[PDB]
Amino acid sequence: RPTFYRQELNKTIWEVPERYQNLSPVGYGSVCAAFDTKTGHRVAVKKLSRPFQSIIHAKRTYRELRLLKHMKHENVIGLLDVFTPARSLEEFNDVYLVTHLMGADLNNIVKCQKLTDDHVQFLIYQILRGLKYIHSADIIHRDLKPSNLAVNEDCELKILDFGLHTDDEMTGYVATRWYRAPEIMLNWMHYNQTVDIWSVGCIMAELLTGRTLFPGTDHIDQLKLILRLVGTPGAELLKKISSESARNYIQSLAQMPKMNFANVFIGANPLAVDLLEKMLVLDSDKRITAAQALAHAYFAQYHDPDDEPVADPYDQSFESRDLLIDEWKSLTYDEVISFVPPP
Numbered sequence: 001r002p003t004f005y006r007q008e009l010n011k012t013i014w015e016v017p018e019r020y021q022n023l024s025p026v027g028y029g030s031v032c033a034a035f036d037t038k039t040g041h042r043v044a045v046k047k048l049s050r051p052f053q054s055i056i057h058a059k060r061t062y063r064e065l066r067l068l069k070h071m072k073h074e075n076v077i078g079l080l081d082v083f084t085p086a087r088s089l090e091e092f093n094d095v096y097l098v099t100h101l102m103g104a105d106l107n108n109i110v111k112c113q114k115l116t117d118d119h120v121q122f123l124i125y126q127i128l129r130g131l132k133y134i135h136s137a138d139i140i141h142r143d144l145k146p147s148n149l150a151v152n153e154d155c156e157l158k159i160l161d162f163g164l165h166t167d168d169e170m171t172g173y174v175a176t177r178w179y180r181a182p183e184i185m186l187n188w189m190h191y192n193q194t195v196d197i198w199s200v201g202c203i204m205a206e207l208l209t210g211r212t213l214f215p216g217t218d219h220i221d222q223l224k225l226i227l228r229l230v231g232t233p234g235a236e237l238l239k240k241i242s243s244e245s246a247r248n249y250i251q252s253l254a255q256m257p258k259m260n261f262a263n264v265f266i267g268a269n270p271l272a273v274d275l276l277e278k279m280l281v282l283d284s285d286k287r288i289t290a291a292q293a294l295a296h297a298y299f300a301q302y303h304d305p306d307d308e309p310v311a312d313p314y315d316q317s318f319e320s321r322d323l324l325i326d327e328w329k330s331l332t333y334d335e336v337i338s339f340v341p342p343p
């Protein structure tokens with residue numbers, strides 16, 4: 001056990017191992033930036049807020065720690081350390097998570113930088129390389145958007161902030177909804193991993209034009225923007241939508257054909273236009289997958305099938321398990337004490 005030291009910053013007690021120095025608040029939890037003297041990295045230290053206050057909260061704490069412990073890929077956020085000052089399960093209450101400190105996100109890049117087609121190729125290639133890994137473990141991210149993509153000066157990218165959202169958070173003219181697949185924004189059906197591929201299409205379109213693809217002022221305005229681009233659904237997709245009311249609303253709209261994407265994304269690389277047509281498909285069964293997209297000719301200068309790895313198997317059976325708060329807490333404590341740091 002390391003030696004801990006205790007200090008109060010911005011009305012919060014932080015008790016952390018001596019290796020973590022120069023704690024500085026930077027904003028589910030509270031977060032400080034710090035310097036890790038053991039590894040030389042600048043890090044983010046997150047102190048969880050009330051992690052075991054309810055069954056839902058205790059299970060969410062366990063879910064987040066299990067997910068972060070599993071992810072070991074160059075294009076995905078991983079866990080550098082996890083610790084508690086508790087010396088026994090009986091006095092266990094606080095959980096701290098340590099990750100690499102991220103600087104710029106993709107928002108900074110799109111708004112403030114002049115991108116070539118080569119930049120778009122490399123950025124989207126890395127998102128898909130990370131998604132092939134995530135999807136191989138039957139994990140769905142659910143919340144891909146520019147603020148959840150970290151990028152550095154050499155254009156290297158990492159996926160973060162997995163979906164572990166309230167009705168109020170998705171209401172109105174908000175970026176929290178503009179990148180979501182229609183079937184999940186509208187609760188049409190049980191959804192699959194290609195909800196994440198719809199998000200990649202929206203992100204790639206924005207990198208090519210500098211503009212949000214579907215900036216709806218509410219859920220239904222956004223659906224109208226989507227159907228104007230990709231066309232209204234046929235009977236084949238309509239049959240897959242659960243709500244009779246939802247089906248009735250969609251059939252109340254005048255029918256529209258799919259638009260010509262070369263006349264929407266004017267001047268873009270024709271191979272980029274082709275890939276967008278394969279991502280932005282309304283019926284999720286027919287969207288391209290991450291593994292299929294990496295083999296598309298748009299990425300010919302980066303694709304290396306011997307350097308696009310898959311994940312170890314991931315056991316999610318806990319998600320269907322009903323336990324008490326103290327049982328979720330004990331499972332979490334076991335995962336804290338068994339953590340083994342990376343090289």
Ligand SMILES: CC(=O)N[C@@H](Cc1ccc(O)cc1)C(=O)NN
Pocket residue numbers: 185186187188219243245246247249250
């Ligand atoms: C036409 C359509 O798909 N309507 C949706 C609207 C909605 C979105 C989010 C909800 O939580 C609830 C409703 C619909 O009726 N889906 N069942």
Ligand SMILES: [Cl-]
Pocket residue numbers: 002003017018019020
């Ligand atoms: Cl230490």
Ligand SMILES: [Cl-]
Pocket residue numbers: 076077078079100
């Ligand atoms: Cl990482």
Ligand SMILES: [Cl-]
Pocket residue numbers: 084085086091092093094095
């Ligand atoms: Cl504690």
Ligand SMILES: [Cl-]
Pocket residue numbers: 107145146147148175
């Ligand atoms: Cl965003």
Ligand SMILES: [Cl-]
Pocket residue numbers: 253254255
């Ligand atoms: Cl019509």
Ligand SMILES: [Cl-]
Pocket residue numbers: 313314315316
């Ligand atoms: Cl597992």
Ligand SMILES: [Mg+2]
Pocket residue numbers: 147148161
């Ligand atoms: Mg985020």
